[PDB]
């Protein structure tokens, strides 16, 4: 019974970050990696990076380094991952997945909207 | 990183056909190759696991097969329900990296 809570939707200004949250339990948080995802209208699933919550070390799929950051608080079981720099390309559906390796399990998506 | 070219990208097809989808990896990935369909607003369902098992729950109508840097997804008799782009992902390494994608869409026969 692991599962991933989401924060709701956003609408941010061209230029402007976000912060989306992702909740996880029903398993040792620090155990697993959690992993990102987005789909923006048109285009391919995308894969975005992971985050080990125990050391937080982190790696960003080439498309996104330097301009994604993830961070954990553990006293909540919670992953963040923070998108700077937002343009049109980047209104999508994100998803966070977790598992031993690969991802097993999925949060319900968090909309963000960029809008002039 | 793993570059997974899936094929076609989009497609047509009826009700009642075969469908058969590509990945192939540019490296050699093993078994660990999945296929998950997609349906725009909602999260990713995983089909077939490690090139060939199907899934829990999930209709037989869906096959995966191959291994190696050559995998295929075959749904055999396609149904209305199947409107989606399915994709595969490899899990040999990180980054985890998915295909371009198959949009499948269904044209009527009538």
């Known amino acids: 019974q692991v599962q991933l809570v989401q924060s709701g939707a956003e609408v941010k200004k061209p230029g402007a970050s976000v912060k989306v949250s992702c909740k996880a339990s029903?398993?040792?948080?620090?155990?697993?990696?959690m992993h990102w995802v987005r789909q923006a209208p048109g285009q391919g699933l995308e894969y975005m990076g992971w985050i080990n919550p125990k050391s937080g070390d982190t790696n960003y799929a080439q498309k996104f380094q330097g301009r994604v950051t993830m961070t954990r608080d553990t006293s909540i079981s919670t992953v963040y991952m923070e998108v700077r720099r937002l343009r049109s390309d980047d209104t999508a559906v994100y998803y966070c997945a977790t598992g031993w390796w690969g991802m097993d399990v999925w949060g319900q998506g968090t909309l963000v909207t960029v809008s002039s | 990183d793993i570059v997974m070219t899936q094929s076609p990208s989009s497609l047509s097809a009826s009700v009642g056909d075969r469908v058969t989808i590509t990945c192939r990896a540019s490296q050699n990935i093993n078994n660990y190759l999945h296929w998950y369909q997609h349906e725009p607003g909602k999260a990713p369902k995983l089909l077939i696991y490690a090139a060939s098992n199907l899934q829990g729950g999930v209709t037989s109508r869906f096959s995966g097969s191959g291994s190696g840097t050559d995998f295929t997804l075959t749904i055999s008799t396609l149904q209305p329900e199947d409107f989606a782009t399915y994709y595969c992902l490899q899990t040999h390494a990180y980054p985890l990296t998915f295909g371009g994608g198959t949009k499948v869409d269904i044209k009527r026969a009538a």
């Open positions: 029903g398993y040792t948080f620090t155990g697993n990696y």
